[PDB]
């Protein structure tokens, strides 16, 4: 990924809507032996997302690096994924496993900061979280820890969803501090939203 | 798995057996 | 595993794995140097490495490496051996301090300057 700063007198750079947040995690040239030598190709693990908390995971195969990055962008574009939150935190401590990828995603009080390793830091920095506390146990990789983090975010659910599963009136599903954090986060959603209307 | 591990182990074992052939006598008498 | 099996006996750490046997848990030891011969490393790295084997005060017989361009030390110099690591010659894991009790600092060394012991230009 070099020589991107450019000014063209051509038709268009085609800049348009959906200015999302896009992170390229790792690139390892992938070789293939054929008759008389090696054929080098490229893999780019592409994370895309918006600051609401919708995450994509794309996996680009091409024999050029920006081609593989662009194919990962289109593949994560094809496949988004909804993550439920509280304010800008996570709901409750989970462990995700993608066959060797263990990631523990635990919430924290706000202000602490996204503390995670670089793959999980990528998937969570694209997402709508600002203050959680994760760790990547096992598998020491990028692909399995990204995919394990997304499986960990599939083990998430709303407080309300849990209440619904059990047919119980909330209050009765959460404890009270987390309901107060719901009041804080929806209150600042009201403040920034009504400042957004004017 | 592979048989290479098995064969390294067995090389050690063989060498040792031989070493006890040749020193058999000597170990008996030097020990007695 | 089967927690009563850990109540019986289990779960101890492995081994301290001591790095240097200079002695005493001491950072550098002065030493009488003998036979300052120059050696040949492993196969991807071919050169002549300027080692000297040193009898540390701690009574042990070791073999240290002399960093820098040349060594002021001849037979029977009082060199101050610290512990290091040189991959390249097997069994030599100690480095002689340059700019010390006997072995003078490296001359015209102008950039590295703390290692190799070169004093500042007047």
């Amino acid at each position: 990924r070099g020589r991107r700063d450019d000014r063209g007198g051509r038709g268009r750079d085609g800049g348009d809507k959906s200015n999302y947040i896009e992170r390229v995690v790792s690139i390892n040239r992938v070789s293939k032996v054929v008759k008389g030598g090696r054929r080098f190709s490229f893999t780019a693990l592409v994370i895309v997302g918006d600051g609401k908390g919708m995450v994509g995971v794309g996996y680009g195969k091409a024999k050029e690096v920006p081609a593989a990055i662009a194919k990962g962008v289109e593949e994560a574009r094809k496949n988004f994924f909804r993550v439920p939150l509280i304010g800008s935190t996570i709901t409750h401590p989970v462990q995700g496993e993608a066959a060797a990828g263990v990631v523990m995603l635990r919430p924290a009080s706000p202000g602490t900061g996204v503390i995670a390793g670089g793959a999980a830091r990528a998937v969570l920095e694209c997402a709508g979280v600002h203050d959680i506390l994760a760790k990547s146990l096992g598998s020491d990789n990028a692909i399995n820890v990204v995919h394990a983090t997304v499986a960990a975010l599939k083990l998430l659910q709303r407080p309300e969803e849990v209440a619904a599963r059990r047919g119980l009136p909330i209050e009765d599903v959460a404890p009270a501090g987390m309901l107060k954090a719901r009041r804080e986060s929806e209150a600042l959603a009201a403040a920034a939203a009504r400042e957004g209307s004017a | 798995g592979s048989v290479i591990k098995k064969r390294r182990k067995r090389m050690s074992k063989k060498k040792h057996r031989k070493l006890l052939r040749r020193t058999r006598v000597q170990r008996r008498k030097l020990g007695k | 595993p089967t927690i009563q099996q850990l109540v019986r006996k289990g779960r101890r750490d492995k081994i301290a794995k001591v790095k240097t046997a200079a002695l005493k848990g001491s950072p550098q030891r002065r030493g009488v140097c003998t036979r300052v011969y120059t050696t040949t490393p492993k196969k991807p790295n071919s050169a002549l490495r300027k080692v000297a084997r040193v009898k540390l005060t701690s009574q042990v017989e070791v073999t240290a490496y002399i960093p820098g361009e040349g060594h002021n030390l001849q037979e029977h110099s009082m060199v101050l051996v610290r512990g290091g690591r040189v991959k390249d010659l097997p069994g030599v894991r100690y480095k002689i301090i340059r700019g010390s009790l006997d072995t003078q600092g490296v001359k015209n060394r102008k950039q590295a300057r703390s290692r190799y012991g070169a004093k500042k230009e007047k």
């Binding site: 409750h92 919430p107 407080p159 599963r165 059990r166 047919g167 | - | 927690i3």
Partner: protein, 130 residues
């Protein structure tokens, strides 16, 4: 047969994982109290106690959602024989951030984590379900 309740919750994880409608069990007192707690929190739908070969039996129907999806998202026996886990009042261990619940058998009977918090008594855990 070494742990009764592990076979109970084990049979609920298997019958929950394999999309079953009901499940049948050897009835006992402690399984009746756990079945009554999982009634009162709504993780199971309802249980009925039959007479059968020699003893009574516990037939639990499981509560599913708007399609085939499950309400009990897991069980885990923690106060297991061999490491029976005890809990003072300071912390009735919170489960799944509070969204899960903790079946805690205090001196007043069998309670949940929240009931062990407000009523001011602790003294066990048992399995906690989310």
């Amino acid at each position: 047969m070494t742990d009764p309740i592990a076979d109970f919750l084990t049979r609920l994880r298997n019958a929950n994982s394999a999309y079953h409608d009901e499940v049948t069990l050897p009835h006992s007192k402690l399984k009746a109290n756990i079945a009554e707690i999982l009634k009162r929190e709504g993780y199971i739908s309802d249980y009925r106690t039959e007479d059968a070969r020699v003893g009574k039996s516990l037939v639990v129907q499981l509560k599913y959602g708007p399609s085939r999806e499950r309400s009990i998202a897991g069980l885990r026996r923690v106060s297991k024989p061999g490491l029976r886990v005890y809990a003072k009042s300071t912390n009735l261990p919170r489960v799944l951030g509070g969204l899960g619940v903790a079946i805690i058998s205090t001196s007043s009977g069998l309670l949940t984590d929240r009931q062990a918090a407000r009523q001011g008594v602790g003294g066990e855990v048992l399995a906690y379900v989310w």
